[PDB]
Amino acid sequence: RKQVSDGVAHIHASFNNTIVTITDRQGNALGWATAGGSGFRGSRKSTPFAAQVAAERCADAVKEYGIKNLEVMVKGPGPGRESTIRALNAAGFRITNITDVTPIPHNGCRPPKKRRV
Amino acid sequence: IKVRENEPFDVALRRFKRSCEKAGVLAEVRRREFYEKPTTERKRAKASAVK
Amino acid sequence: RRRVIGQRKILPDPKFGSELLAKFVNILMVDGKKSTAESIVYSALETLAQRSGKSELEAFEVALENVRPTVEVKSRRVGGSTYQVPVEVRPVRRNALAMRWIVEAARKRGDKSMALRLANELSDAAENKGTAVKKREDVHRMAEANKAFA
RNA sequence: GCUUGAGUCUCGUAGAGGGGGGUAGAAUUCCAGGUGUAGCGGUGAAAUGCGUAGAGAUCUGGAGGAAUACCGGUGGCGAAGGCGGCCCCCUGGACGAAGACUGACGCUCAGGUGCGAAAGCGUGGGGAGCAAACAGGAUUAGAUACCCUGGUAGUCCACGCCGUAAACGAUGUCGACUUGGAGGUUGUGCCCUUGAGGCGUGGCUUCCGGAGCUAACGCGUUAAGUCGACCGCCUGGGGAGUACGGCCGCAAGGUUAAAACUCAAAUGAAUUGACGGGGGCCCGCACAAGCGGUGGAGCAUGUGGUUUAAUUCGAUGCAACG
RNA sequence: GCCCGGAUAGCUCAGUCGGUAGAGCAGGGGAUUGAAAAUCCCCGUGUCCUUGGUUCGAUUCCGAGUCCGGGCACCA
């Protein structure tokens, strides 16, 4: 019941899952979505056409205000960097600026050895 | 990476920034590092680029 | 394997002359006793009069409408495991497939006799009943219902 | 005596060469607080784990440590090992050019002295990420593993020790000769320097390759070609870089280094093929698309069993069983 | 010698207010394999340790016995 009018939307695009939260201008949570919470779980998610149905779920929780326009914050790789923005363009929302906020360091921390099969 | 266009349309312009960083220098990290594995494979893959 | 020709032109119904009804009798046929097939379906096909009272002709197609799917699965030996990537179904098999469900499920109906056990199923088709109509959604619950892979 | 070897002086050039001290920005983790709400994280799936004591996400502020994206290269510097942010201080070597100077002052070098990746050791610091050990979850016939969630030493600093590595170009140092081609990097001379530029002349360095060399692979002016000076080293495989003795070490352990006995080979490159849970391209009812079956049922038939005085002999993966 | 517990399928074990008892393994018959395993399907012939009693009926409840197991045998 605040009517933020316009607020950026963060798209935490990951591999094992993807989640988009339609925060406000300053950066306050107004409504978040989630593939894991979008019916199918396990790992069936991930896929782009699976995240789209997730972020689209926001237009059902963050619609209580009246977002007439909004930007997009895509972070991290994975099947949900495009899908999300698309579903949002159809949901009825607008757009003000697309950008990738993926954490790309300068050889700072030393990543995990991991995987070796 | 910064997009912005007048006349609402989902054209793209997005894969334009997709040539300097993007899923590349990403997966580059992803798993472990390299150390000797690179200085070597980086100097062998170079051999490839000859013909 | 790599062979690529055409379809087998089937002979139309023994009366109405229709390929759509042709392969229908064949799919229903058994032990090459094609005769019985005709005398078993061609009857129930017209016995609809007692079930309605008019030019029972389109009833067949209309009845199949409630049994015409448009999406199926298809496991694929990829990604180490086995995918499922569901895909629609061209018309060539749409009409065909349905006919199977209409018959392959009209036999387990357990009524008076195959001749009639079939008739009723048609009425149940357009009116949604029996496994015939079931198989549709029971199949759709995969494709279009699991596009996560599609 | 001489000057071309070697060296000195001058003036420039490039450089992640070294030692010290600063400093910057990105990211991670953590602490605090705001928003917000039922998921997050992870895998092939999963599960452990974290979440309603409010995570994850998001935003603000703070603490701390390690490493410096892009430039970055087939690049550069170093004796080797190795050495990448920017700045200052102390410092080494290499190279070019006009030259000026010394005058064989040189090459090599057992023993000797010193330098040595990483792991490891001692004392004291530090500790974000990563990660032997260790602990859970999973996989599996089992799984003291690979995978997942955690995680200690350690990795970082100082100072001292240990001296090894596939410490590799698996190719000792120094010098003189010997067809060529394309390229990289850095100095210098010159050319309407009118230009990106063009022609030479030095240093270092890639790739191809001729003669020759080579067992072959291949090396080929940076030689494994043609020669000269000095040094290290090898003499069949196993036993064995082991034992013993010496020396060194805090300890791991290092260095030097056998025999007994045993085998008729061990080995190197290259060839033919076979195979690969290698790659490319193909065909077959091989699969996929469907039609009908077998597997259950009663009966036929054969076989292995079991039995029998005998159950006659044979046939046994696709190629054995109407 | 004393007190407490165990004795159930071939092994190791689980189980019952008293009437017809099971699991993992081994075993066996199919399967799949070229053949073994591993895996898949279907399979328990247990006088429930002995001997007395209660009872209509005892693996079960009561007394005793053997055997095993734990503890104890001390001042002297």
Swiss-Prot record, chain A:
GO cellular component assignments: cytoplasm; cytosol; cytosolic small ribosomal subunit
PROSITE patterns in alphabetical order: RIBOSOMAL_S11
Record's keyword annotation contains Thylakoid: no
Pfam families: Ribosomal_S11
Keywords in alphabetical order: Methylation, Ribonucleoprotein, Ribosomal protein, RNA-binding, rRNA-binding
Gene Ontology MF terms in the entry: small ribosomal subunit rRNA binding; structural constituent of ribosome
InterPro entries in the cross-refs: Ribosomal_uS11, Ribosomal_uS11_bac-type, Ribosomal_uS11_CS, Ribosomal_uS11_sf
GO BP annotation list: cytoplasmic translation; translation
Quaternary structure note: Part of the 30S ribosomal subunit. Interacts with proteins uS7 and bS18. Cross-links to IF-3. In stalled ribosomes contacts ribosome rescue factor SmrB.
Functional note: Located on the platform of the 30S subunit, it bridges several disparate RNA helices of the 16S rRNA. Forms part of the Shine-Dalgarno cleft in the 70S ribosome.
Family in the record: Belongs to the universal ribosomal protein uS11 family.
NCBIfam families: PRK05309.1 (NF003698), uS11_bact (TIGR03632)
Note from the entry: Has been predicted to contact the N-terminal domain of IF-3 based on footprint studies; exactly how IF-3 interacts with the 30S subunit is controversial.
Name of the featured protein: Small ribosomal subunit protein uS11
Species of origin: Escherichia coli (strain K12)
